[PDB]
Design a protein around this motif. Structure first.
Motif, mmCIF file in Angstrom:
data_model
loop_
_atom_site.group_PDB
_atom_site.id
_atom_site.type_symbol
_atom_site.label_atom_id
_atom_site.label_comp_id
_atom_site.label_asym_id
_atom_site.label_seq_id
_atom_site.Cartn_x
_atom_site.Cartn_y
_atom_site.Cartn_z
ATOM 1 N N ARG A 30 0.815 -1.196 0.000
ATOM 2 C CA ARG A 30 0.000 0.000 0.000
ATOM 3 C C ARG A 30 0.851 1.248 0.000
ATOM 4 N NH1 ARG A 30 -3.822 0.223 4.928
ATOM 5 N NH2 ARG A 30 -5.256 1.457 3.526
ATOM 6 N N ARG A 39 -6.309 2.990 -0.371
ATOM 7 C CA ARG A 39 -7.172 1.943 -0.858
ATOM 8 C C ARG A 39 -6.951 0.679 -0.081
ATOM 9 N NH1 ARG A 39 -9.605 4.277 -5.024
ATOM 10 N NH2 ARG A 39 -8.387 5.678 -6.475
ATOM 11 N N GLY A 40 -8.052 -0.075 0.141
ATOM 12 C CA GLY A 40 -8.019 -1.403 0.698
ATOM 13 C C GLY A 40 -7.893 -1.380 2.195
ATOM 14 N N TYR A 41 -7.925 -2.587 2.807
ATOM 15 C CA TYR A 41 -7.882 -2.790 4.237
ATOM 16 C C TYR A 41 -6.464 -2.709 4.733
ATOM 17 C CZ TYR A 41 -12.605 -4.585 3.553
ATOM 18 O OH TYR A 41 -13.965 -4.744 3.201
ATOM 19 N N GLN A 42 -6.303 -2.684 6.081
ATOM 20 C CA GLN A 42 -5.038 -2.698 6.779
ATOM 21 C C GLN A 42 -4.292 -3.967 6.483
ATOM 22 O OE1 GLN A 42 -5.352 -2.304 11.038
ATOM 23 N NE2 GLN A 42 -3.121 -2.645 11.443
ATOM 24 N N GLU A 44 -1.939 -5.298 3.381
ATOM 25 C CA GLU A 44 -2.400 -5.811 2.127
ATOM 26 C C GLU A 44 -1.274 -5.602 1.169
ATOM 27 O OE1 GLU A 44 -5.954 -3.938 0.787
ATOM 28 O OE2 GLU A 44 -6.487 -5.488 -0.707
ATOM 29 N N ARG A 46 -1.035 -6.165 -3.446
ATOM 30 C CA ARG A 46 -1.780 -6.560 -4.609
ATOM 31 C C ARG A 46 -0.729 -6.870 -5.619
ATOM 32 N NH1 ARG A 46 -7.902 -4.202 -5.297
ATOM 33 N NH2 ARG A 46 -8.356 -4.106 -2.986
#
Lengths: 100, 148, 175, 258
Positions: A30, A39-42, A44, A46
């Motif tokens: 992140r 963006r997104g949860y704690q 992570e 991608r």
RNA sequence: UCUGCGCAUGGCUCAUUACAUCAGACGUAAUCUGCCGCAAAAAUCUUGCGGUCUCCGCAACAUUGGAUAACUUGGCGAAACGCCAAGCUAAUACAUGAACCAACCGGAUGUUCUCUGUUCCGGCGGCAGGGCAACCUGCUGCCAUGGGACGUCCAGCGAAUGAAUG
RNA sequence: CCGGCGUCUUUUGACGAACAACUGCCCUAUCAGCCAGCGAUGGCCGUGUAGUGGACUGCCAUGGCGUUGACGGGAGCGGGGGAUUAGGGUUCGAUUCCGGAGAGGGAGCCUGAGAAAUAGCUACCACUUCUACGGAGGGCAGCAGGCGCGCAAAUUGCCCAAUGU
């Protein structure tokens, strides 16, 4: 000038740490420059595709910073000063700024 | 002190981990095993401690008498099916299930495995009492409190 | 991932368990930490209790204790002589609980000489005290045999107790 | 982690209905267990009737107008189990919850200086750090520095006006004692005997007034007082005596003829 | 928009599945546990000013430090709950840090001096003589079941190991 | 000068999580032997886990289960309960409550007190949607609704007023 960042002709950022004259797919956390922070949860990561550090002819835009300044002024940059958006909101900073 | 090599055959040694018995003293001399340092633990449900545990030599970490292994909820009874295995016996409970339709009982047996303390060594056909301890192997959950 | 379960294993009847459930994160092995000798390096891992446990790699120092006198001092771990589990371990000088080891032995010497106001305390402590012979010979030379009685692979600290006569005499003869 | 509860799986000592709604409140954890407690919202709404709806109970409690243990609460859901004094100062009324005879939550009304009294059963004693002894209770309260005579399963009279513990009362001998749970709830009697079974539940035999003995578990004993004329706290609507089925029905009819 | 909390619960579906799963009874002295309740808390050499060597002397609601988003500016890409550079600026985000206030509890002690053991079985130090350098003899001083006074170091909670208690 | 909130660490009740065991469970023998190279049963020392344990490594021992039906196969989520019966029974349970498991098929992972989560992530496979074809996505066994399927099953409606979170 020192080089800083810039992008591919597909919008995909350059990364200083990645070394390639090409684009590769990598795990991107992140806090990295390939995927936005918010963006997104704690906790992570991608898979984003992006470009390495090495330049070629695939660059649409390149961002720098002036370090040493020439004897030929360039418009809108070295002929122009823009003030700060906001002054300090910390107490002690007001004492360093007005030297009181 | 000095070694007792009757017990030992291990590549790790064996010691009692509850209480230091490895101190050198002349207070373990001129005595069979009585003056030697031991750990002992009562089982308070009416299971009287043997002599053997109290005065003994034997080192086991999987019996309640010389270890911190504890006796809990269940206590069952059963015979001896076989004495085979080292410090492990095989107990066979037998009881009666009832069937309502035929109004008649049936015989059904649980063949179970147990860890028999080296204190006891009951013969085939003897009856044993066994308590509820923490897991000790894959199948073994029990321990031998007493023997009849 | 790695799991600790009876549900990939044969029963007592020789039959096989059949599954209906995907593995939990509650049941959970992790790879073994390898504590050796060399420069201290400690890599934490987060655990289920909401706290960290520390993976000892390459501990070359331990906090060692002398039995009977209720003391202890730090000293340096030099070698591994022996282990129950394998010979292979010993050669790489891995440190895992109930390895016999070898230590610098220097602080113990120092201590025992201290074991005008001072002077008469000594004479009182000299009285009603003795030491095993096999101990003192080694302690003179400046090497000793000890055991590591803390597990270093999940605390990243290696603590040990020093062998005394009964047990010392056994491990000696195994060498 | 459970955060929902369904009306049927909830106690019907809260006296919910099968129809109307689908959910019941699951209270926040506190002094008392899920089965033995009764949540604030249930009390205020369905019994006292200072609220007709869920939202109205939030209105009262969040604001604050309600105290339990003499402390004001801004909590919407909180347990209220047994021997808890609740006070609404706006009405000026002091309720003491208890177990009524026939398994019902009692709400009993007390003089104002009794509402500073409370009784807590001790569960464990243990020494904590600094050699400071602690009695831990069934409401989770920590009594620092309890008397050296304290034992498991005894009551400690507890001042809520300022927090401390005056003289204890023991479970020893025949003493006036009442039951908690087990469906002998609210029934009061002397201890006749205390049986021991070690490694298992310890039976006790109680004998209520006008005879009719019975048996209940040690765990379900909660002391009241030394004697029935030395009681510190009030009894619910019935005195702690049950009656036969026939007599229930008889009396129901007799009153219905008015 | 940063920060905190929740989203793992509810809801829906029966495919696997026979020492599995589940139901009644039972244990976890073999363990974890946010929110909630009753509670606990004495380690910490800091801050400011003046002189001044990085050192001292005073003073004491403690007077702490550094960035990052929104935003602004340049933007990129066909699109993308896709992204880049520079300039900003917050905290119950992050990083630092609390002397005095300060009770009570011990151990290790010191080449500090004050009482002391009206004696010699022992030890230590110094000097002289002989010496096979291992050692012996003579003389002098100090200490020996003791407590005061003064100085120094370690001392809290949680966790690890050994030893004693329980 | 006082009040109400907020937070660190320590402590233990509660709400739960994770293990283990006593007893019970449909048909089939034209399924009678099953289990150990690579753990089968146990002992010994360690390793790992929040923790006990062949859970796992190394060493040693040769055990463990079976006509009171092991092992294998077929049918089936389990229970509370439904239908029918004078009684004994007979038969059903996909489905409102409780417990377990799953989110196209599998595996791996992060974060968190708690997940091996899937309207979180990573990969492969079977499908599947956009693209000036350089790339980028999708997971209804959540509610409606559509296609397919079969003898067979509702509105792309309104509301947070109630009941809960």
């Amino acid at each position: 000038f020192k080089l800083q960042g810039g992008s591919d002709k597909q919008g995909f950022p350059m990364v200083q740490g990645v070394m390639a004259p090409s684009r590769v797919s990598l795990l991107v956390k992140r806090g990295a420059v390939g995927f936005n922070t918010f963006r997104g949860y704690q906790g992570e990561r991608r898979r984003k595709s992006l470009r390495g550090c090495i330049l070629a002819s695939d660059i649409a835009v390149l961002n720098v910073v002036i370090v040493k300044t020439g004897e030929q002024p360039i418009e809108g940059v070295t002929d122009v000063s823009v003030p700060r958006r906001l002054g300090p909101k910390r107490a002690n900073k007001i004492r360093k700024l007005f030297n009181l | 002190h000095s070694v007792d090599l009757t017990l030992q055959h291990e590549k790790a040694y064996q010691r009692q981990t509850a209480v230091n018995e490895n101190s050198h003293n002349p207070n373990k001399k001129h005595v069979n095993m009585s003056g030697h340092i031991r750990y002992s633990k009562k089982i308070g449900l009416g299971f009287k401690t043997p002599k053997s545990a109290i005065n003994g030599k034997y080192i086991d970490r999987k019996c309640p008498f010389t270890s911190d292994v504890s006796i809990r909820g269940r206590i069952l009874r059963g015979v001896v099916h076989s004495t085979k295995m080292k410090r492990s016996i095989v107990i066979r409970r037998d009881y009666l299930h009832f069937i309502r339709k035929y109004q008649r009982y049936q015989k059904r047996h649980r063949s179970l495995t147990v860890h028999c303390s080296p204190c006891f060594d009951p013969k085939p056909g003897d009856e044993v009492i066994v308590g509820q301890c923490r897991p000790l192997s894959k199948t073994i959950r029990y321990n031998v409190l007493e023997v009849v | 991932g790695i799991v600790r379960s009876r549900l990939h294993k044969r029963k007592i009847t020789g039959g096989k368990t059949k599954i209906h459930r995907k593995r939990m994160k509650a049941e959970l092995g992790r790879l073994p930490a390898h504590t050796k000798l060399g420069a201290r390096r400690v890599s934490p891992v987060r655990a289920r209790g909401g706290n960290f446990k520390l993976r000892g790699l390459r501990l070359d120092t331990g906090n060692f204790a002398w039995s009977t006198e209720a003391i202890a001092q730090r000293a340096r771990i030099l070698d591994v002589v022996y282990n129950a589990t394998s010979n292979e371990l010993v050669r790489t000088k891995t440190l895992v609980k109930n390895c016999i080891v070898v230590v610098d032995a220097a602080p113990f010497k120092l201590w025992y000489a201290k074991h005008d106001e001072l002077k008469r305390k000594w004479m009182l402590r000299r009285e009603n005290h003795k030491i095993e012979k096999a101990v003192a010979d080694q302690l003179k030379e400046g090497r000793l045999l000890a055991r590591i009685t803390s597990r270093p692979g999940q605390t990243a600290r290696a603590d040990g107790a020093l062998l005394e006569g009964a047990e010392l005499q056994f491990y000696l003869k195994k060498l | 982690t459970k955060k929902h509860l369904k009306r049927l799986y909830a106690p019907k000592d809260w006296m919910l209905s099968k129809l109307t709604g689908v959910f019941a409140p699951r209270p926040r954890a506190g002094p008392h267990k899920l089965r033995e407690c009764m949540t604030l919202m249930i009390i205020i709404r369905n019994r006292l009737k200072y609220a007709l709806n869920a939202a109205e109970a939030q209105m009262i409690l969040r604001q604050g107008l309600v105290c339990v243990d003499g402390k004001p609460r801004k909590d919407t859901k909180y347990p209220v189990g047994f021997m808890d004094v609740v006070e609404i100062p706006r009405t000026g009324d002091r309720f003491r919850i208890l177990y009524d005879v026939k398994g019902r939550f009692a709400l009993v009304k007390v003089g104002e200086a009794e509402g500073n009294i409370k009784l807590l059963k001790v569960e464990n004693v243990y020494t904590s750090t600094g050699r400071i002894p602690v009695a831990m209770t069934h409401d989770g309260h920590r009594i620092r520095y309890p008397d050296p005579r304290t034992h498991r399963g005894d009551t400690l009279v507890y001042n809520l006006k300022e927090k401390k513990v005056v003289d204890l009362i023991k479970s020893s001998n025949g003493k006036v004692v009442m039951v908690t749970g087990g469906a002998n709830r609210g029934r009061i009697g002397e201890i006749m005997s205390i049986e021991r079974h070690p490694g298992a539940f310890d039976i006790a035999r109680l004998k209520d007034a006008a005879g009719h003995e019975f048996a209940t578990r040690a765990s379900n004993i909660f002391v009241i007082g030394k004697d029935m004329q030395s009681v510190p706290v009030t009894l619910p609507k019935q005195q702690g005596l049950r009656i036969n089925v026939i007599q229930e029905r008889e009396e129901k009819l007799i009153a219905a003829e008015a």
